[PDB]
Amino acid sequence: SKMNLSEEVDLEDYVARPDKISGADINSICQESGMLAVRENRYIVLAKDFEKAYKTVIKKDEQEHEFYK
Amino acid sequence: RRSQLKQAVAKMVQQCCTYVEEITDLPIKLRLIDTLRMVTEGKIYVEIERARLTKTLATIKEQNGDVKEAASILQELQVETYGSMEKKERVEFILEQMRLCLAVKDYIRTQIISKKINTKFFQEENTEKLKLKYYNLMIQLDQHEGSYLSICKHYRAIYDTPCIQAESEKWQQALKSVVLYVILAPFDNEQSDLVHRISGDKKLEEIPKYKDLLKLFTTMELMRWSTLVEDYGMELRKGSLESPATDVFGSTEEGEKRWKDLKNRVVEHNIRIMAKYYTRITMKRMAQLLDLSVDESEAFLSNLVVNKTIFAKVDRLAGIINFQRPKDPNNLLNDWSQKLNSLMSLVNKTTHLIAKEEMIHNLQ
Amino acid sequence: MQSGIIHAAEEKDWKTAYSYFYEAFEGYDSIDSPKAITSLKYMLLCKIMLNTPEDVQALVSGKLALRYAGRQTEALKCVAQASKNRSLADFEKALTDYRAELRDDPIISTHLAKLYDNLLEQNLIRVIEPFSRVQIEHISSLIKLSKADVERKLSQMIL
């Protein structure tokens, strides 16, 4: 609610994902997307910011070795 | 980004200024829409809103006035209340749309946004006309509701830069409207000292009629209305300061309402003063002194007493109004003890006088 | 919604029922207007029943309410106007004006009597307060009502 956060950004795309993050990572997600927007001197945050921020925070490679299944 | 877009967009905007004075609306709307897509980026801040202001002017003038186009400018004001690195032009920016809001007739939003530059005063240090424009709007705003004291604050704020009072031809009504509007306000301590401060001014002498009005409304017992209207109802159309007087007379609704307000003011003054002096009073004497029917007297004082303004307890059966008759069985000898203290102090003080005076006669 | 309706049915509490109705509105929030409108009407009438009309006027002033426009809100706002002015003629006038919905909800008809009685007592205390001993005919004329019922109400009040 504190960020301008554009108008067209979609949040349902991120809540529906599965990754059981903690509650102190949501804050870091939003903070990081904001800083990403500040870097390029644009003062409204866009969707690509959220995408790259999410990928930056999570960092889970695969851990899904397949031939067991 | 070292001007790599600022120079480009500035050149394109000056091109737009050159074409718009000759080009038709069909192409110029498309040009503005195309040039607006780099507004959202930030980083340029200025030069993006000027296009917006020009667009607003164009879309007003094509219809010679519109309300939706006014809505096209409400959003970005606070956005660039801090975008531009300049004081004056943003002030002009965020007061210009005020008149648009007034044309739309939205008082609440207008006064919400008006809070922005109240503390950014002294914006006139090089442009008095801008300060005058700022003060000319609230006089219109509060003229809608009933507040009758803030407008005096505004007019007393037109006591500014002597580019205002060095032009007596309008300065007259400048200092007349303040003394006419102070009277309309209901009695209170703030008015009690405002009438005092507005009075006691040297050049105020230059007009005798309004000086007389203030003198009458400062003292005690007042008039029966009839004589006052016969003695001041005609000066409201002669002279060179009657334009606020016209405002009090001209508009039918406005004039009628303000007559009603002055009427209520005088009858209220009568009530307060007689309650200050009298103690107990009959019905018919009240009706006779107020020059109106008994029923109207009762109805008029009813909302007064329910307002916790006058401490009265009318008893209808015998019709004896009874101001200032609370009574107490513990206060009595409080008063008694007070008188005792004063008497002891006074007898003390007399003896010093005795001694020092006998000193200058009987030393030898 | 159903929980709030049952809660207010037997007339035990209003704070909890209003709470339920607000969170149910958050249930209808931004996904279903046809039920959000009736949620707002229930919210406003419940808040009126707590003798909090200025609360209603401020609350419908909110941006969320500004989005959910309507015409029933005019009816509720005028009823609040009548309540904070303490007038029985005003409330009767508002009832005549918006009889199409006020006397349309089955639930409203139950609570109308109690709200009427409360308004009557408040109006009478305002009218008779400003002074002392008085003939009953004047107060009867002022309230615009017959005699006998008026002094019966005065007796019940003083008792």
Question: What value does the CA radius of gyration of chain A take, rounded to a whole number of Å?
Answer: 14
> Is the four-CA dihedral B318, B324, B329, B332 of positive or negative sign?
negative
Residue B208 burial (C-beta neighbours within 10 Å; 0-12, 13-18, 19+): exposed
> Is the four-CA dihedral B107, B109, B114, B115 of positive or negative sign?
positive
Residue B145's SS3 state is coil
Residue B281, phi then psi, degrees to nearest 5: -150, 150
B38: nearest CA in chain A? A42
The residues facing A35 across adjacent strands are none
> Is the four-CA dihedral B40, B44, B49, B52 of positive or negative sign?
negative
Residue B198, phi then psi, degrees to nearest 5: -60, -30
Question: What value does the CA radius of gyration of chain C take, rounded to a whole number of Å?
Answer: 18
Q: Which of B54, B69, B60, B59 is nearest to B18 (CA)?
A: B54
The answer to whether B139 faces chain C, any CB pair under 8 Å, is no
CA distance B21 to B57: 13
The answer to whether B43 faces chain A, any CB pair under 8 Å, is yes
Residue B225 in tokens:
């209305």
> After what residues is chain B interrupted, C–N > 2.5 A?
none
Chains A and B touch (3+ CB pairs under 8 A): yes
Q: Which residues of A touch B40 (CB under 8 A)?
A: 44
CA distance B286 to B295: 11
Q: Which of B190, B211, B117 is nearest to B147 (CA)?
A: B190
* List of residues 6+ apart from B113 with CB closer than 8 A: B74, B77, B78, B94, B97, B98, B101
CA distance B255 to B322: 36
H or E element that contains B321: strand B321-322
CA distance B279 to B322: 6
Q: DSSP string spanning B255-281?
A: HHHHHHHHHHHHHHHHHHHHHHH-SEE
- C104's torsion region: left (phi>0), alpha (psi -120 to 50) or beta? alpha
Which resolution, in Å, applies to this structure?
Answer: 3.8
Strand bridging mode B321-322 / B280-281: antiparallel
Q: DSSP string spanning B164-228?
A: TTS-HHHHHHHHHHHHHHHHHSPP-HHHHHHHHHHSS-SGGGG-HHHHHHHHHHHSSS---SHHH
Q: What's the angle, vertex CA C72, arms to CA C71 and CA C76, rounded to 5?
A: 125
Residue C91 in tokens:
């409330």
The answer to whether B75 faces chain A, any CB pair under 8 Å, is no
CA distance C9 to C99: 22
Q: Which of B227, B235, B247 is nearest to B211 (CA)?
A: B235
CA distance C78 to C97: 10
**Local structure of residue B322 (DSSP, 8 states):** E
CA distance C16 to C28: 18
CA distance B43 to A40: 9
The answer to whether B314 faces chain C, any CB pair under 8 Å, is yes
CB B34 within 8 A of CB B41: no
CA distance B115 to B359: 69
The chain A residues in contact with chain B (CB within 8 A) are 41-44
CA distance B8 to B101: 34
CA distance B11 to C84: 61
Q: What share of chain C is helix, strand, coil (3-state, %, to 5)?
A: 75, 0, 25
Residue B321, phi then psi, degrees to nearest 5: -65, 145
Method of determination? cryo-EM
| Residue owning tokens 């229930």 | C42
B303: nearest CA in chain C? C130
Residue C10, phi then psi, degrees to nearest 5: -90, 5
Residue B203 in tokens:
């050049």
CA distance A43 to chain B (A): 6
CB A53 within 8 A of CB A28: no
Q: DSSP string spanning A5-49?
A: --SS--SHHHHTS-----SHHHHHHHHHHHHHHHHTT--S--HHH
Please list, residue by residue across B64-78, b when 16 or more beta carbons sit within 10 angstroms of its beta carbon and e when fewer do: eebeebbebbeebbe
H helix runs in C61-133, sequence order: 63-67, 72-85, 88-97, 99-102, 108-128
CA distance A40 to chain B (A): 9
CB B180 within 8 A of CB B210: yes
H or E element that contains B352: helix B331-359
Residue B344 in tokens:
């002891």
* List of residues 6+ apart from B200 with CB closer than 8 A: none
CB B88 within 8 A of CB B124: no
CB C45 within 8 A of CB C16: no
CA distance C2 to C20: 9
H helix runs in B36-144, sequence order: 49-61, 68-71, 76-79, 88-104, 107-114, 128-142
Give the CA-trace dihedral at B225, B231, B235, B237, to 10 degrees.
60
Q: B touches which chains (3+ CB pairs under 8 A)?
A: A, C
Q: Which of A50, A40, A61, A56 is nearest to A6 (CA)?
A: A50
Residue A69's SS3 state is coil
Relative orientation angle of helices B168-184 and B252-277, to the nearest 10 degrees = 50
H or E element that contains B362: none
CB B7 within 8 A of CB B14: no
Q: Up-side HSE of residue B254: CA atoms within 13 Å toward CB?
A: 12
Residue B193 in tokens:
């000292």
Contact across the interface for B43 and A44, Cβ inside 8 Å: no
Residue B92 in tokens:
């002009």
CA distance B210 to B232: 9
Long-range CB contacts for residues B92-100, cutoff 8 Å, separation at least 24 = B92/B130, B93/B49, B93/B53, B95/B130, B95/B133, B95/B134, B95/B137, B96/B53, B97/B70, B97/B73, B98/B137, B99/B137, B100/B70, B100/B73
Residue A32 in tokens:
């990081």
Residue B151 in tokens:
């407008």
Q: C touches which chains (3+ CB pairs under 8 A)?
A: B
* List of residues 6+ apart from C57 with CB closer than 8 A: C77, C80
Other Cβ atoms less than 10 A from the Cβ of B326: the count is: 7
| Residue owning tokens 């704070």 | C15
CA distance B141 to B81: 22
Residue B322, phi then psi, degrees to nearest 5: -135, 70
Q: Which residues of C touch B305 (CB under 8 A)?
A: 130-131
The answer to whether B208 faces chain A, any CB pair under 8 Å, is no
CA distance B69 to B50: 15
Contact across the interface for C135 and B316, Cβ inside 8 Å: yes
Q: Which of B88, B87, B109 is nearest to B98 (CA)?
A: B109
* List of residues 6+ apart from C142 with CB closer than 8 A: C127
| Residue owning tokens 């009005």 | B213
CB B81 within 8 A of CB B105: no
Question: What value does the CA radius of gyration of chain B take, rounded to a whole number of Å?
Answer: 31
Residue C44 in tokens:
């406003």
